[PDB]
Design a protein around this ligand. Structure first.
Ligand code: ATP
Ligand code: ADP
Lengths: 240, 96, 673, 482, 223
């Protein structure tokens, strides 16, 4: 959108206030901006400002989201946030809670890890019951199953996740995430390769499933980047 | 085309491009004494019958093939009327 | 995402291989996709249901019979899921597995041929064992409205097979974009489409159907191209029909019907319309969007040149011959017999026909040797043949309106069915067939029977006798070898006797009035045929001759037929063509067989015999067909087998086929001259 | 023209490795204790897994091209790891506080994880990391193969002492591996001179005497009758039937493909001899058939098609190929003509062994616990019948072959007899839920790829040797012996 | 001429094993320059056969691959013997391509019995070979060709004009395992042990061959 702010003695300058991603004819995702972008005389200036303000607004909304994920409960934040932020919140929730359960196991023999596992088991039902069968809109639709694929794989890992502590191989096997608060920043971790989130607005995209082969490839590319190379996959027709 | 000439002789719409009728009108005068319908009259389609009769009576075809190569045998197999109606007087294989 | 080695594929320099790291992606998945699709629908038993889906579809793929139109891929799966969405969306709260078994079974019932059904459901029972049976959701308005019009029409009989086929058709139309009606000829696909459109039109919501056949018009004309002379554009017929149909603010529901088997070259460019895109794209740069006002149906028989990309894109329904099959076809003919000639004829003919046909047909195939059936056939053609011969046997008494006894009919049955099953056999086979008839059949000629077979004699219409003779006739006084044209031989006389019977019958159902001899090269084919043709009356009966070579094409046959007819007899035309005309072919085997095994040549003749007419190729108009209201057909074969080619089995159903043996009497042919 | 191809020496590769990235990688340490052993571990891992391919299919299904790009890559990571770990370390308890479990996953499934196409190579390479890394830097232990000090020229003398020729037990592999290596290196060597050089006489007559020895065709009009006359899993449970039983439809499918091959061979033998003795314009394929008939290898017309139709590809013309084809038709005929179900099925003869097993699965669900058992609930297992001298659910399979141990009480194989018979492994299926076990594969051909993997067998027989000993040993239950 | 028509067919096994006759001519004319004339021309003629063979031999090996080393030496032996010894091409194919009687031996071995059974190969599979008296230890003993010589045809093995080729047909048919050390053996016999020995190209010495007008190709392998 372009809102004309009428400067004194100057023709009203059109400033950007929100961004939208449209799919189909009506279905779309709208994203507000607290930090605004104003047109100017130099095109690169307001293009760069659009970029930077988008990055910053995504950062701060994710910062508030990392808190609101655990306080409100699943359904509220899943329905309120966007698809990208909701997936991030689900992943960070699951990682933090499995960490807590593992450390309580490390203290003594405890049920806490199993109780957290059961909490995920419960989340599965309340997710799959309602928001999957009836819904309005294509982007709202695709977001839901985008979440459900990840959640089913989450549960499939959590059932057989027989690791004793965080140091274990079975736990430092997957793509974990940690939104550090002391230094406010997201960090996606692989076994020890870490990379900061890049904060590019994508909306709802149909990300695919996670087979052990896709695991293999995640591992491989993570280390290729750790070592500053380029992964050059090879194979026959149509294998992903 | 030459196989259909051997068999029927009527090329589809070659003598029938608005010319069969004039060509047959140029032959009814021989017809009136040839078939001798009491020198009274004739008909239309029978003129074409007599014309195909005449052309097949007086159109002889001599085909002369090589006995060697690759194509002769399969050509004879593709066209049955080629070897069939055509009599085979067989040129001697240059004997001694 | 470099790729290891094709045509036009090179190598990376050893300077470049150092930088890159390998990444191995070998096997894609099917189960995780199933479970995420059950999610997208909204189910709760996702993990167990995914295993159910996977194991069921894998087993149905591998251990079931191999049919070309079968498909169990991701597209079929996604269709099942997009159906199951609504099924759970209703107020239903029953167990998801009942609904799932119901959906899977009722979805996959349609395509399977008759034999795979018990295997299919016995496989279903092994995967859904706690569930025993569920009723199929029945649509009461449809099931009540069908018989009304079935009775409203005159020549319609209602059958439960018709009910089930038309309802499966209804459901597949409800679910998918377009569909095919796969099935053999004479099985009622067009009638099913017609009555379905009628039942849709009854409760409002009208429906219109358009017909087209792709391989009788050229594809460049079907879709339009750029002119090769004037550099301007020309419209394509399918695109014009599409633009005329897909307009909004209409009340129709258009069904564009392609009619004729699927060749990839023309159909594969409809991938965008038969996929989820629902968009037509042309080489002109024109795109046109599909609307719900339009459907695409293919009244194709079967898929023989189809890739999975098109097999799996659209729905399909398989109609089987058993709708009207063998004894059932006999019964339908008896129903026709009890329509007008209903004094006692149906009953009094059937009282022999039943046992004479059921308990006899299978004891002639391989019970006695019969190891030389030069034309390998299926039973139904011999049956339909004996029927069309029996109608012609009885036509005389039907004309004069006389009712005969049962013995005369027994002998007429014996005479008719001696031939049409004995016309594909040699002398030793005819004498073993003969002794079989002597052993367990109604009386054949027994007066002298002096080393003579039953085939020599015939039933006389005037009285119950078996006599045969050839009349005497010498020659005209002219001395040309052509003037000594042909002599009245016994083989010629019996050929005429067999031929005229079927050539008088006036276009009954299951009858196309078309004859076929089978003789060796130089076995009096053209002799007997021309002997018959000379007896024609050119005042009401003409004749046309044609021969076949290897490289004869649709342009050639289309051209010779168009030059023969010279008119479009469909639109009230052809005064000179108002007389009857016949087309004679010496050898339909010679035309080239394609490398696949499907000779393209006989397809034009097949369409001409089955429906009459064809689509024009005159650079002016494409979607339309010339029609032939009247034409007759006769042909000869050359002992097919080995080096000699064979005709497509699809066309065998029409021609009256029988043998033409050597005369064994060449001492008495050249005596008169 | 000069050729400078590499040798196959462990020291030679190890010494070369020690002359590629050296004297700045080895000297820039800031730690002599931990990461110095880490370098020594990875380079020893590097030189071992590369040299393992020397044996052949026993070591690697297909050849892989590991190079230093992965090695010097594996280093850049563990450096970045150790620098970031010790960046927060103000004091080292004993030279480090590392938790070396992530380095496993990386070295296992990344660097050498790119080349790996097979599934089995995944866990095989993970087992090598387990036995070599130990999951710890001991500081004081004997490599299974010595252990170093902390000096550069010491590494050179360390490499100097290494023997020239080693024994395969350094890889954990059996000593008999020397034979198969020479044989395959032998075979491929002759195969090349068999291409330096690439006739119309009595040999075509010998084939003329042959084509009247292969069995006749099975006309379907008879076979469709035969399978339909009789069929059933057990005579008491069901009457005769055709299409419904999974074993009769498998009978039909096998007779079709057998007939498809029998027709092609009889025709091409005829048209090969019907060109000289008979008359026909000579065909290039027929000429290739003549040359193949004279040599040992059968023509390509019976093995491959433009895409692929492998049927029974065996080495000799008639010694095993037509022998195997005959045996298949013989065992198929009495499996058909008499129609009874014999004991001691031959798995090799079947074209699609997997359908045989899944057919058995379906048979158990239908006949037994039917309903009680669903097809997705049945799981698979095997009990190997430990007996020589001798129905119930499952089947009796004949002709399997083991490699490298015994049936039960598996021990070290002697010098000869590398391929050993496999006793009767009766099958067993049960519904699900109603680490001492070792799992073995079953390959059809001895080529050992991802394909030809019919099923997997749990082989619990361990004693003192853990299954990883067998995993590194590369045991398997193959079917053919060639 | 027999030697040259050997190095021609090695171009057919693989591209880049291609060379002219002019290079062979320079190698041939040189070989006469190198060590041919000292005295006693007849013994120098036998110095041709000893030296000329080795010279062209080592020249082709410089461009040969590892899997092609024992190949080229095998055909050179055969092509030498296809003219003088008149070795039958049928027997050559018998050496390249190929049970009711014996019971102890394996089915894998019975294939080889029918392989060898189908001149005296079809004459001594009987009780002579089925004696099973001392040859059982022979089949068991590693290196079956050297120490425990088959006495099945002793005198035929002593003559050595063809007894080598006879023993090799026996070795390959019986034990394909040790075909290749045996391949080194008769190559060393018929052609000389100086062909079965290691070679390593001094790249300093290789530089001497390289004039300014000829380049140095390198057919390398991975690693
Ligand atoms: N709709 C049709 N009805 C009847 N016959 C047809 C029809 N379409 C094609 N044919 C037959 O196909 C013949 C032409 O064969 P066609 O040219 O298609 O062969 P092709 O597959 O193109 O191979 P080639 O190019 O080598 O001839 C026609 O003469 C005609 O007999
Ligand atoms: N590792 C892989 N994963 C998925 N697809 C692959 C991979 N390797 C190749 N492909 C597929 O192969 C197709 C083209 O490969 P082609 O095999 O190009 O190789 P070449 O040109 O060397 O014959 C592409 O569609 C690509 O998706």
């Amino acid at each position: 959108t372009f809102e004309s702010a009428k400067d004194k003695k100057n023709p009203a300058l059109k400033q950007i206030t929100q961004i939208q991603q449209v799919i189909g004819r009506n279905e779309e995702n709208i994203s507000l901006t607290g930090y605004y972008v104003k047109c100017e005389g130099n095109i690169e200036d307001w293009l760069k400002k659009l970029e930077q303000n988008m990055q910053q607004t995504l950062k701060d909304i994710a910062s508030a989201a990392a808190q609101q994920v655990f306080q409100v409960g699943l359904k509220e934040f899943v329905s309120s946030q966007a698809s990208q932020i909701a997936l991030l919140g689900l992943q960070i929730l699951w990682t933090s809670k499995v960490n807590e359960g593992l450390e309580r196991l490390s203290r003594n023999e405890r049920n806490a890890m199993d109780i957290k596992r059961n909490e995920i088991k419960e989340h599965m039902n309340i997710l799959s019951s309602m928001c999957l069968e009836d819904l309005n809109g294509a982007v709202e639709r695709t977001k839901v199953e985008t979440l459900v694929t990840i959640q089913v794989h989450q549960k499939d890992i959590s059932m057989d996740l027989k690791c004793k502590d965080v140091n274990d191989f079975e736990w430092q096997k997957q793509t974990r995430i940690a939104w550090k608060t002391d230094i406010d920043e997201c960090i996606i971790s692989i076994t020890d390769w870490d990379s900061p989130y890049s904060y590019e607005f994508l909306g709802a995209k149909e990300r695919l499933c996670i087979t052990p082969l896709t695991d293999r490839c995640y591992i491989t590319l993570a280390q290729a980047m750790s070592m500053y190379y380029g992964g050059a996959p090879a194979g026959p027709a149509g294998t992903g | 085309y030459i196989n259909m000439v051997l068999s029927t002789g009527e090329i589809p719409n070659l003598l029938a491009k608005d010319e069969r009728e004039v060509w047959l009108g140029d032959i009814s005068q021989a017809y009136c004494k040839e078939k001798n319908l009491g020198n009274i009259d004739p008909p239309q389609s029978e003129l074409w019958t007599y014309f195909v009769d005449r052309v097949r009576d007086n159109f002889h075809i001599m085909l002369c093939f090589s006995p060697v190569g690759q194509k002769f045998r399969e050509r004879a197999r593709k066209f049955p009327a080629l070897f069939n109606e055509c009599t085979i007087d067989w040129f001697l294989p240059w004997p001694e | 995402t470099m790729n290891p080695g094709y045509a036009g594929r090179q190598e990376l320099p050893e300077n470049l291989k150092v930088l890159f790291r390998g990444v191995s992606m070998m096997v894609p998945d099917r189960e995780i996709i199933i479970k995420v699709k059950l999610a997208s629908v909204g189910y709760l038993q996702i993990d167990l249901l995914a295993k159910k889906f996977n194991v069921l579809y894998r087993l149905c793929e591998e251990q079931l019979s191999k049919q070309r139109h079968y498909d169990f891929g991701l597209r079929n799966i996604l269709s099942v899921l997009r159906t199951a969405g609504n099924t759970k969306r209703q107020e239903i709260k029953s167990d998801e597995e009942m609904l799932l078994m119901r959906s899977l079974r009722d979805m996959n019932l349609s395509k399977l041929v008759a034999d795979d059904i018990p295997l299919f459901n016995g496989l279903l029972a092994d995967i859904f064992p706690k569930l025993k049976e569920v009723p199929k959701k029945l649509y009461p308005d449809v099931e009540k409205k069908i018989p009304e019009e079935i009775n409203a029409e005159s020549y319609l009989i209602n059958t439960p097979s018709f009910q089930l086929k038309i309802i499966q058709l209804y459901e597949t139309c409800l679910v998918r974009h377009g569909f095919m009606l796969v099935g053999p000829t004479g099985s009622g696909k067009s009638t099913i489409m017609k009555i379905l459109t009628e039942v849709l039109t009854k409760l409002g919501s009208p429906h219109k159907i358009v017909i087209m056949n792709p391989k009788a018009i050229t594809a460049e004309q079907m879709y339009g191209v750029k002119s090769e002379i004037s550099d301007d554009w020309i419209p394509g017929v399918f695109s014009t029909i599409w633009a005329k149909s897909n307009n909004r603010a209409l009340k129709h529901t258009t069904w564009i019907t392609c009619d004729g088997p699927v060749d990839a070259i023309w159909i594969e460019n409809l991938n965008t319309v038969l996929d989820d895109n629902k968009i037509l794209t042309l080489a002109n740069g024109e795109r046109i969007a599909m609307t719900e006002n339009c459907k695409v149906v293919f009244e194709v028989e079967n898929l023989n040149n189809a890739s999975p990309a098109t097999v799996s894109r659209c729905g399909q329904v398989y109609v089987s011959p058993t709708d009207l099959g063998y004894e059932a076809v006999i019964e339908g003919w008896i129903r026709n017999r009890k329509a007008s000639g209903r004094a006692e004829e149906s009953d009094k003919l059937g009282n022999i026909l039943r046992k004479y046909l059921i308990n006899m047909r299978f004891i002639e195939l391989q019970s006695k040797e019969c190891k030389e059936p030069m034309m390998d056939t299926s039973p139904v053609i011999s049956v339909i043949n004996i029927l069309n011969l029996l109608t012609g046997c009885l036509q005389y008494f039907v004309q004069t309106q006389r009712t005969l006894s049962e013995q005369e009919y027994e002998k007429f049955i014996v005479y008719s069915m001696a031939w049409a099953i004995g016309g594909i056999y040699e002398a030793q086979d005819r004498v073993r067939f003969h002794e079989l008839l002597l052993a367990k059949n109604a009386p054949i000629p027994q007066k002298g029977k002096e080393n003579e077979t039953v085939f020599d004699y015939y039933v006389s219409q005037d009285y119950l006798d078996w006599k045969i003779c050839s009349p005497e006739e010498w020659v005209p006084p002219q001395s040309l070898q052509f003037s000594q044209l042909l002599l009245p031989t016994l083989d010629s006389f019996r050929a005429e006797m067999l031929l005229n019977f079927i050539l008088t019958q006036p276009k009954s159902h299951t009858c196309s009035n078309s004859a076929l001899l089978i003789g060796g090269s130089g076995t009096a084919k053209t002799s007997s045929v021309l002997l018959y043709c000379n007896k024609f009356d050119p005042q009401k009966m003409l004749f046309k001759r044609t021969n076949f070579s290897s490289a004869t094409s649709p342009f050639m046959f289309q051209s010779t037929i168009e030059a023969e007819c010279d008119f479009k007899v469909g639109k009230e035309f052809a005064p000179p063509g108002n007389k009857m005309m016949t087309i004679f072919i010496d050898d339909m085997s010679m035309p080239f067989v394609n490398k696949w095994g499907d000779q393209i040549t006989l397809e034009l003749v097949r369409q001409l015999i089955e429906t009459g007419g064809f689509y024009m190729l005159d650079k002016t108009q494409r979607g339309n067909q010339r029609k032939m209201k009247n034409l007759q057909y006769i042909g000869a074969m050359n002992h097919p087998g080995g080096g000699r080619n064979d005709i497509p089995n699809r066309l065998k159903r029409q021609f009256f086929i029988f043998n033409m043996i050597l005369p064994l009497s060449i001492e008495g042919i050249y005596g008169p001259i | 023209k000069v050729t400078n191809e590499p040798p196959k020496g462990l020291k030679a590769g190890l010494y070369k490795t020690f002359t590629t990235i050296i004297t700045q990688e080895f000297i820039d340490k800031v730690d002599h204790s931990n990461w110095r052993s880490l370098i020594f571990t990875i380079c020893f891992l590097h030189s071992i897994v590369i040299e393992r391919k020397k044996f052949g299919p026993l070591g690697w299904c297909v050849p892989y091209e590991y190079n230093y790009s992965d090695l010097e890559a594996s280093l850049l990571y563990i450096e970045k790891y150790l620098t970031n770990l010790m960046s927060t370390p103000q004091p080292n308890s004993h030279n480090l506080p590392i938790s070396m479990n992530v380095v496993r996953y990386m070295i296992c499934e990344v660097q050498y994880g790119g080349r790996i196409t097979d599934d089995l190579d995944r866990e095989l390479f993970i087992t090598y990391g387990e036995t070599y890394l130990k999951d710890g830097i001991f500081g004081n232990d004997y490599f299974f193969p010595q252990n170093p000090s902390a000096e550069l020229i010491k590494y050179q003398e360390y490499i100097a002492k290494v023997p020239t020729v080693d024994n395969p037990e350094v890889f954990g592999l059996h000593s008999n591996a020397d034979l198969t290596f020479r044989l395959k290196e032998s075979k491929e060597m002759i195969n090349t001179v068999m291409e330096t050089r690439p006739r119309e006489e009595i040999v075509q007559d010998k084939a003329k005497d042959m084509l009247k020895n292969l069995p006749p065709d099975y006309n379907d009009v008879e076979v469709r009758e035969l399978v339909s006359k009789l069929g059933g899993p057990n005579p008491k449970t069901s009457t005769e039937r055709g299409m419904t039983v999974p074993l009769n439809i498998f009978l039909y499918q096998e007779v079709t493909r057998m007939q498809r091959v029998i027709g092609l061979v009889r025709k091409t033998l005829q048209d090969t001899i019907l060109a000289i003795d008979g008359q026909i314009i000579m065909t290039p394929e027929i000429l290739e058939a003549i040359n193949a008939i004279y040599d040992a290898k059968v023509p390509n017309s019976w093995l491959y098609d433009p895409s692929g139709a492998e049927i029974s590809w065996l080495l000799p013309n008639l010694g095993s190929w037509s022998t195997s084809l005959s045996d298949r038709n013989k065992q198929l005929n009495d499996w058909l003509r008499s129609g009874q179900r014999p004991i001691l099925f031959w798995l090799t003869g079947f074209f699609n062994p997997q359908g045989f097993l899944t057919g058995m699965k379906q048979e158990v669900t239908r006949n037994h616990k039917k309903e009680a058992w669903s097809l997705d609930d049945v799981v698979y297992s095997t009990t190997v019948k430990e007996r020589e001298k001798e129905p119930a659910e499952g089947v009796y399979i004949k002709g399997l072959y083991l490699e490298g141990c015994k049936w039960s009480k598996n021990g070290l194989d002697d010098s000869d007899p590398k391929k050993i018979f496999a006793d009767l492994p009766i099958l067993h299926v049960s519904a699900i839920n109603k680490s001492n076990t070792y799992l073995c594969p079953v390959y059809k051909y001895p080529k050992r790829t991802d394909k030809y993997l019919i099923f997997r067998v749990g082989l619990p027989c361990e004693g003192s040797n853990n299954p990883s000993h067998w995993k590194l040993r590369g045991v398997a239950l193959l079917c053919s012996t060639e | 001429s027999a030697i040259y028509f050997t190095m021609i067919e090695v171009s057919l096994v693989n591209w880049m094993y291609n060379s002219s006759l002019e290079q062979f001519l320079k190698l041939f004319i040189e070989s006469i320059d190198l060590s041919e004339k000292a005295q006693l021309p007849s013994n120098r003629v036998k110095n041709i056969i000893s030296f000329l063979t080795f010279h062209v031999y080592r020249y082709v090996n410089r461009g040969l691959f590892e899997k092609d080393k024992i190949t080229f030496i095998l055909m050179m032996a055969f092509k030498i013997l296809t003219t003088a010894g008149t070795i039958s091409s049928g027997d050559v194919s018998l050496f390249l391509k190929s049970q009711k009687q014996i019971s102890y031996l394996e089915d894998n071995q019975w294939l080889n019995i029918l392989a060898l059974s189908k001149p005296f190969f079809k004459e001594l599979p009987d009780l002579i070979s089925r004696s099973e008296n001392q040859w059982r230890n022979w089949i068991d003993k590693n290196d079956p060709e050297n120490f425990p010589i088959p006495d099945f045809a002793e005198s035929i093995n002593q003559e050595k004009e063809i007894g080598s080729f006879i023993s090799l047909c026996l070795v390959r048919s019986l034990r394909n395992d040790r075909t290749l050390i045996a391949t080194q053996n008769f190559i060393s016999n018929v052609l000389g042990k100086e062909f079965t020995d290691p070679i390593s190209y001094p790249i300093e010495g290789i530089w001497q061959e390289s004039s300014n007008m000829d380049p140095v190709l390198f057919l390398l392998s991975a690693g």
